[PDB]
């Protein structure tokens, strides 16, 4: 019924390992099967550089990768099940940043939502 | 879109009282609730963010609590500087929405006004106008009654009053009453008096001058 | 030393546009987000929009989407808010505010500007007359004396009053302005001082009315 997003404020992991940035969302059009785009960006909401982008075709559960920085970002959540959780592989100290979760439906301009508050990823050495 | 309702709209509290004001959101705002204090003529001042985090420098008597839809701010022992309007704000999603505010007014012991009168300045008089100012300084409570008398004739329709906001150091108010006449009218009369009644006064006090003096 | 400086006041004609400024100093401008907030007198606060001063990325309250435009000028570290097709319903105070660490779960407003009082009106600006309220036997109380300045016939609000160039603040009452039947405003600013001080101290009210570019210093003397 309403757009909303569930994202923890903090995730910690050791450099060289893999971290999971969880993200789930609620949305209107509760059985939407149209074209979907999932985006993760870093640094700043709405304005930071994207680190991951995939898109799913109408009626398809496969979110095809359009962008994955260093090849180390991968979607774990099924977006047709309201899960946009992201896996970061082979973490580097430079990955210690704030990340923001974003989804875009097709249709009206307001069928899109990005986490106003992001998840801080802590990379331990 | 998210509605924010504060309670109460206004309240009186005494020095040293423990005061709590509440804010309820129409949705879960995930503890992204901030509280601000504002006094007349000044910009808001952020006190608490993320529902329970004190901005550095904010006194420890302030605290905040809540989750989901229900939030509160508590002052554990009220000080005079704590008067003002308090606003809550959800910043969980766009558009940010503020509550309607809580007016916090301080109750203190009765204090009679110090009453002063100022004749019009010579500079104003040569411009053709005479303004006579009666000043009621640092009284409580706010209610005060001022009447102008010109040669013992009670005046109406030629004065304007203004009351200060409550004072952050002693929780008193002050009042100005300004009687404005033409220079010709002013010079037709002799005795200018303002008569003040107030709960702190055992009987009405009169301040007056003679236009000659 | 963080500062957000806004002009105290702006008088603009109905139908016209105004560009309100918020000048930053004392920090790296491009690293922070700035928010604009409206306050109509007697009412509460309402969010206008956010802008990232590092990228010109804006988010607006839908209510204002055809009314307000947020921009930044990074050469002068100035944020701007333009309001178009002004009416009397737009007369209000507009604040800019800075966020700490916008986007962190721990972000918050860490600095507020002083606000711009916008008056929408067809009327010409008018600067005040300033008259002394002289201390005398009729303005003493228990060894203190009251004195002040009467600031008359100006438009629009506000005027600012200081005493002795800001060195005197304690014991000052600058009363809320009253509306005179001419549509011009008037106020008094009074201060209480030691009676004994009156023969050695100087008391000068400093009256500033920016819309008319009026600056007046009035020395107040006994009698």
Author numbering:
A (entry chain A): 42 to 166
B (entry chain L): 1 to 213
C (entry chain H): 1 to 52, 52A, 54 to 56, 58 to 74, 76 to 82, 82A, 82B, 82C, ...
From the paper:
Sialic acid-binding Ig-like lectin 15 (Siglec-15) is an immune modulator and emerging cancer immunotherapy target.
In this work, we have determined the crystal structure of Siglec-15, bound to a blocking mAb, at 2.1 Å resolution. However, the required electron density to build d2 on Siglec-15 was missing, likely due to its intrinsic high flexibility. The V-set domain of Siglec-15 is composed of two β-sheets made of β-strands AA´BB´ED and CC′C′′FGG′, which are connected by a C64-C142 disulfide linkage. The predicted canonical ligand-binding pocket contains the key R143 residue at strand F, which serves to generate the conserved salt bridge with the negatively charged carboxylate C1 of sialic acid. Interestingly, the V-set domain of Siglec-15 contains an extra β-strand, hereafter called C′′. Additionally, the light-chain CDR3 (LCDR3) makes polar contacts with the G strand and G–G′ loop.
